Design an enzyme around this catalytic site. Structure first.
Site, PDB file in Angstrom:
ATOM      1  N   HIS A 118      25.128 -29.824  -9.032  1.00  0.00           N
ATOM      2  CA  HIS A 118      25.175 -28.417  -9.441  1.00  0.00           C
ATOM      3  C   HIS A 118      24.833 -27.466  -8.075  1.00  0.00           C
ATOM      4  O   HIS A 118      23.985 -27.549  -7.703  1.00  0.00           O
ATOM      5  CB  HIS A 118      24.151 -28.264 -10.546  1.00  0.00           C
ATOM      6  CG  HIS A 118      24.308 -26.727 -11.108  1.00  0.00           C
ATOM      7  ND1 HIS A 118      23.484 -26.362 -12.091  1.00  0.00           N
ATOM      8  CD2 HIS A 118      24.969 -25.599 -10.826  1.00  0.00           C
ATOM      9  CE1 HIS A 118      23.437 -25.055 -12.379  1.00  0.00           C
ATOM     10  NE2 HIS A 118      24.479 -24.801 -11.526  1.00  0.00           N
ATOM     11  N   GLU A 175      29.180 -28.511 -11.168  1.00  0.00           N
ATOM     12  CA  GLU A 175      28.296 -27.730 -11.967  1.00  0.00           C
ATOM     13  C   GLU A 175      28.347 -26.368 -11.413  1.00  0.00           C
ATOM     14  O   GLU A 175      27.618 -26.348 -10.350  1.00  0.00           O
ATOM     15  CB  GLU A 175      27.214 -28.373 -12.592  1.00  0.00           C
ATOM     16  CG  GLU A 175      26.896 -28.288 -14.037  1.00  0.00           C
ATOM     17  CD  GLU A 175      25.958 -29.572 -14.498  1.00  0.00           C
ATOM     18  OE1 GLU A 175      24.797 -29.245 -13.818  1.00  0.00           O
ATOM     19  OE2 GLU A 175      26.124 -30.387 -15.230  1.00  0.00           O
ATOM     20  N   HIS A 210      22.248 -33.388 -20.760  1.00  0.00           N
ATOM     21  CA  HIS A 210      20.936 -32.392 -20.525  1.00  0.00           C
ATOM     22  C   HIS A 210      19.757 -33.025 -21.313  1.00  0.00           C
ATOM     23  O   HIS A 210      19.783 -33.128 -22.597  1.00  0.00           O
ATOM     24  CB  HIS A 210      21.161 -30.967 -21.198  1.00  0.00           C
ATOM     25  CG  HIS A 210      21.829 -30.179 -20.069  1.00  0.00           C
ATOM     26  ND1 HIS A 210      23.175 -30.348 -19.679  1.00  0.00           N
ATOM     27  CD2 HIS A 210      21.515 -29.109 -19.459  1.00  0.00           C
ATOM     28  CE1 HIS A 210      23.491 -29.323 -18.977  1.00  0.00           C
ATOM     29  NE2 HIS A 210      22.619 -28.565 -18.747  1.00  0.00           N
TER      30      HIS A 210
HETATM   31  O1  LIG Z   1      20.168 -35.267 -17.716  1.00  0.00           O
HETATM   32  P1  LIG Z   1      19.674 -33.879 -16.886  1.00  0.00           P
HETATM   33  O2  LIG Z   1      18.665 -33.058 -18.095  1.00  0.00           O
HETATM   34  O3  LIG Z   1      18.922 -34.066 -15.856  1.00  0.00           O
HETATM   35  O4  LIG Z   1      20.784 -32.732 -16.646  1.00  0.00           O
HETATM   36  C1  LIG Z   1      22.024 -33.517 -16.972  1.00  0.00           C
HETATM   37  C2  LIG Z   1      22.880 -32.301 -15.980  1.00  0.00           C
HETATM   38  O5  LIG Z   1      22.711 -31.131 -16.212  1.00  0.00           O
HETATM   39  C3  LIG Z   1      24.479 -32.706 -16.220  1.00  0.00           C
HETATM   40  O6  LIG Z   1      24.925 -33.143 -15.339  1.00  0.00           O
END
Ligand SMILES: O=P(O)(O)OC[C@H](O)CO
Ligand SMILES: [O][C][C]([C]OP([O])([O])=O)O1O[C]1[C]([O])[C]OP([O])([O])=O
Ligand SMILES: [O][C][C]([C]OP([O])([O])=O)O1O[C]1[C]([O])[C]OP([O])([O])=O
Ligand SMILES: O=P(O)(O)OC[C@H](O)CO
Ligand SMILES: O=P(O)(O)OC[C@H](O)CO
Ligand SMILES: O=P(O)(O)OC[C@H](O)CO
Ligand SMILES: O=P(O)(O)OC[C@H](O)CO
Ligand SMILES: O=P(O)(O)OC[C@H](O)CO
EC number: 2.6.99.2
Lengths: 235, 235, 235, 235, 235, 235, 235, 235
Positions: D44, D71, D185
């Site tokens: 990201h 991202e 997420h």
């Molecule tokens: O698994 P997380 O919470 O760290 O985040 C996943 C990302 O936002 C997706 O790439």
């Protein structure tokens, strides 16, 4: 969902308590198990604080990443501790070896009522017995944990198959009364599969066999191995 | 100049006897330790049988690839067994924690001669006290084993360097009387080196800490780590 | 004695606080590090509580098998917490980056006495400067930790050699004044040896490089690797 | 086909930027993850460049063996960078947390067309909401990524079951409109299975939980563990 | 300090280049080696770009955590690349097999002058020859790397001991002229120690043997094994 | 229904022949692969001898525990050798990439009969083209090996599903003509599954990707990983 | 200088020949041993081809990366084989247990000369007996290998000390006559150091103990462990 | 239900007995096998005590955690031992290769009855021959074990398919007579699945191949691998 594994770490403390040193520490074993296949951690607070201590319980409650299963007798002291600890689960056991629910309905009804007020999901540890199973549902408990001890101690293959059927049959009957059902006690690497094969089983709580393997192999593998056999049985 | 490691597998048995099943089996623990850095295996046969049992001692005597160090109290029953078993070593222990040899010069004198006539190398578990050391030499024991418990329990860094010095003087003193000297009890991964650096030390007997580390990482790496620390200290 | 390794786990918390979740838990990391070569664990309680929180210190104080080195600024708040916590060690730092002891002898003197009265062994985080060093001894601190930061940021092999020599002389000067001398900040798997070879060094405190190696290889091998390079340098 | 795993390495950078040093390097982490179960790598690029930097994206674009999922927020800056970089995938997110596509159909429509004209397959990060879903299909995006955050923060097994059901229905609705559906997420080793079992899911994007397991066990086993739990759920 | 290990990763690229795919990638091997015992990474840019490419060099220069050693012929093209790449080291090799310095003094003097202006430390790869060694010092180069090829290819023990002595003797002579000396070429797991035992040696650059072991064992262990043998030889 | 893996160790030899020493030795690579998931070992004996040599083929034929699959061009020299060596399998290859069987029906016809009279199971390496498949059946070959190179090289996800379909139709077509079908060339850890899921597939021959993964992780895990992926795809 | 380890793999063949199958193959064991600490490989070609066979020798002679040490009885058959085989070393053994060199001065004198013309270095396997050693020096053999069997089979610690001393004196004596001396046979993990510490020792040839450890831990670790113990002894 | 794996450790003793030493000890191998996939342990007590001995049997009977399967010839000596030993299973074997049950109906009828009174489950090792199977059912044996040697030694893939079919038909036939059926002998990593896939199979007894793999990879992995392959076949 899939069959869950609750790892009882009591025996880590019985190793510690044989010397009054701080090692090995149950807080460490819990992190390990939780990251190697455990879906919950089980501790049994005995009145005599033989292995697990109030200290372990207080820390564990702040360090567990999954959920605590507090095993304890149905006595005022423990209910009060359970109420203040607010563990996600509480397995009520005796102070063939299971809790006598059929014969202490009022006692059990009040304990379940009280623990649920504190927002704790209650499980009653009982024998693969329909009278006890029906009583469990009637006193209002959401879970039951079928004693797998007699299946484990079976001395012959006949005795074992008979015990297996009594357990499987008990689980089907309990599910029909709307109870969610767990099993545990005596489960080992060579006898867990037939129990894990039972569809109604929600979670197996295993302790001694796992710790007994860990001393040789390390907790991580000991837990991953058990989880693997369990999922294999269901596949 | 080559420090040996003697692993005490007593607590493997305590873990087993907490359940009454066969696992974990001390016989397995010995095979692992002997192949991961142990030069000898120690088992304490207590009158109460609590952990190590007669079966254990009987099979261990036939399975060990190195040699047995039987930890026992000075009684007729035990002395009888020892002579029957013919363990390579015998470490006399009571049941500051060390044996009172000076206060029982005759009982110990006969105990040694007897075990010695059986081909058993005798070691007297004693405190880092010159009176006792003199007694052990006078009594004829080939070995003594300096109690490292007070050093392991020393709360402060000062109370510790204090006990280290006492053990170091007691070891040089013992060596000047022709005694070979061992040390054991309380040694951990963190306090072992200072003890291992003591020149006179022949073998360190270690149990609890190793088993305690074993439930986390497995006996093999637990034993190997301890041996590695010990040799690093000597180098 | 052996050169010690103090592992700073602040950055385990850094990774944790980026999300509000409870993992990874500094309490777990401490157990791993203490069993893989760490002789002490170091946490820096920052006033903004960026990473390490009051909970961590509170639980860590109860779960560490070795000893805690609490890194903190010299403020009424922190001093009060240190006294209540009773860490084994306390490393005073600023809120090239070392503490200005020479210019605040009164403050540091009161701080040292106060913590010392609480049983806490004090360490003054300072630059490789004999004025600061001389002052640290004068204010009463039993330890100092030379700032190895400039040595680590050395842009040329020359700046580096020069920074090394300066730490080394500072260390020797420190020891002659009776101070036990530690070092840390910026040490890595490629620059730790030259510092570990310095004889007067008691303990190196290393954080970031280890956590950075850990996300790749896992904490255990990361700590063991570091201890090994450190003992090779002394050998 | 197989359920895919996209590993988000942002947090490797988080650990790096806390110091100015170059380690740990997101470029290394990507190689490890791609060879341990990751089918794609996700970064990201934040406008503040908190963790992942222009360098990372520039080098990663040249070293990844699989494909990049960039991202980014929907801003002129990011869109321009995406077009220049030509990532395989682009996941548009906000600067419950999903994109408001339904309320910005024009903006999202232009964004999708623009990126699509650059050969980039677009994914719209949205909540499990059919209005947003319906709109994503209408604006022309080939993919969407359901926000599994609320499901992850479920404070009660009930809130969770309810959140799961909502993702599942959303997924089925998404597929019927022709959208390929991803999710991510907050997914963890303990909650990933229920989501991976959802048939319409194409790829799960997981970051934090994996890096959090990595500092303990190392990245490779952390990624492999996750892929394994994911394929077990599908099995 | 201690004997350094420079790992030549050229052969990783010769594996890649046999197919025109992107794997295996030298950028990955470099991270691995650097974290398993390598103190520097060596790459040889050949005019024909047989294995290592300008792409590898450009990325490696941004990803290496330690230092790059650019191997190259003394030609205008390479000098220009060296000048713009600014690697920490540059080893000049031929376009018994070593560079002919004695016979091309002006050429070599200008190359060293030029590379040093760009702030690059220059090493001349030569035979264990005093005439070449004296010439190296005179043209101004700070390092020399003694060709260990003939020692490696020795067909008998006599031939090997003779070659060993020629090398050791050469190294002593070079050090006396103030040169810093490296060695490499043909070094293997079974012949490296006698070379590492030579005190004057600053760093050994090893490639083929390491990669040849890696295919069987993994780069990490292959590098750690070589480093271990090298430090053992000096102990 | 049980997919076999055939590991091509050609590139082990290319790595060796880049130096002229004996390592890495293909004979070692075969022992490792056969014990980590390989059901057969493939070696291509090229006229130019570049990688695999006569010695290799001669020793391999005596060391393999499974069976040899000799990759060769249809010439008299090669056919001569094959009949002499008696490899279990023989895979005819040129020296879209596949053999032109339709355009040489007689040469191939005799080639097969000849090798078949030697007890060699013949496989014709061909493109996913029905004309060639019909030719191979008509010519008498027991096996064909569908070239997966264009599928591996497909740039877009679309150009890929396109080639997959062609290979899937070609495999079902081949099976309907009584041919057993294999596939190989270009398969990687990331594209293998789609190919493994094709029912008709008897054995996938894979080389470069495995060797490429091997220099990083070691041949054993590289082969085991590939086999695991293949079986997961079939399950 | 470096104490060398020669691994005897006869017992790999012993295990193979117990079933007429081809596994386990001595050729594989040799690759493993040479990459784990062995500096040489030893095989005893018994006249009855009990374990090691002619193909073993033939293939091994082509696959060994280090060098072969051929154990054999003195007979024309063996001499012809040895001569035709051209192994680097030859250790003449009888077919206490040592070779009676004194009693057959003529035969050995011709054996040694004959083998030496072939460029084979000869070692005579003898008892730690001065008569036999003088005899061995007189006949011209460049090496002797002291039979450590009596030391290995020593029951009491006294009986064992006598044996050690005898080997050490014999070693010193042998050296004074210009003989180079090896040892081995019956050497184990627990008794090897005392022998490795003997300064005159050039190489220890060990087989059985290693193979016996290998069935439990795998050959690689069993060899590395033995080499480690040996180097520990000499440092 | 679960296909079981019985590990035959005779060849551990085979390796031991080749030198009159105590290692490797079958007792250790059994602990390892039982914790790595073995559901039973098999030892053949040969009349000549070639490999397994009476102490082995005696101790094993006390250390096995699962159960013993005693292989033995039918003689009074063996029957007395078996009866006194009370192993869970007994597999009568001859001392094609199967036991001639048809030709000795009387002897076996008494053997089976005799062993059964002792509570020993009896299995007759026979060829996949209907005559012998009818005979085995007539005599009353509860199990048969089909000799897979001919299948294992099958040269061509045809010769092998015939053998498989013969075993499968015999298995189905045996089952129709109320017999439970095991298989084994000559089973290997590459040929076990086809046999494990036979639905009537209750347990496969394997020894040699596993031990042969164990010398390379260590017993633990060799057993786990075999069990894994077996379960893969039945799923
Ligand atoms: O698994 P997380 O919470 O760290 O985040 C996943 C990302 O936002 C997706 O790439
Ligand atoms: O929880 C569950 C458990 C199980 O265990 P096991 O044995 O099966 O493993 O449990 O419960 C019980 C406990 O409490 C026990 O404890 P102790 O310790 O007392 O024995
Ligand atoms: O650098 C150093 C190196 C070494 O290598 P080895 O072989 O020893 O390993 O080197 O230099 C050289 C190079 O250049 C080589 O390359 P190639 O690849 O061409 O062969
Ligand atoms: O290390 P410990 O404290 O468990 O005890 C050592 C044993 O008593 C053996 O002597
Ligand atoms: O190694 P560092 O740079 O992370 O920091 C070391 C700490 O400041 C000391 O505990
Ligand atoms: O996997 P590849 O691309 O290396 O090649 C496979 C071999 O050609 C064997 O058929
Ligand atoms: O170690 P051993 O007893 O097996 O035998 C060694 C061989 O005789 C080689 O010298
Ligand atoms: O697998 P095998 O050939 O070694 O022998 C197996 C034993 O006969 C056990 O049934």
């Amino acid at each position: 969902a899939e069959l869950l594994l609750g790892v009882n770490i009591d025996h880590i403390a019985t190793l510690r308590n044989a010397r009054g040193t701080a090692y090995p520490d149950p807080v460490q074993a819990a992190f390990i198990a939780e990251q190697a296949g455990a879906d919950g951690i089980t501790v049994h607070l005995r009145e005599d604080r033989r292995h697990i201590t109030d200290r372990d319980v207080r820390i564990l409650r702040q360090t567990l990443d999954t959920r605590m299963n507090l095993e304890m007798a149905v006595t005022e002291e423990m209910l009060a501790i359970a109420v203040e600890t607010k563990p996600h689960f509480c397995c009520l056991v005796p102070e063939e070896g299971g809790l006598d629910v059929a014969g202490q309905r009022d006692k059990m009804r009040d304990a379940c009522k009280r623990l649920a007020d504190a927002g704790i999901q209650v499980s009653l540890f009982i024998d693969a017995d329909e009278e006890q199973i029906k009583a469990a549902a009637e006193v209002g408990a959401p879970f039951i944990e079928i004693h797998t001890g007699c299946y484990a101690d079976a001395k012959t293959d006949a005795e074992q198959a008979q015990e297996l059927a009594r357990i499987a049959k008990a689980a089907t009957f309990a599910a029909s009364l709307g109870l969610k059902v767990n099993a545990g006690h005596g489960l080992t690497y060579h006898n867990v599969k037939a129990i894990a094969a039972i569809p109604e089983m929600h979670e197996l709580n295993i302790g001694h066999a796992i710790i007994g393997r860990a001393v040789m192999t390390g907790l991580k593998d000991a837990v991953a191995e058990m989880k693997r056999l369990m999922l294999e049985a269901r596949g």
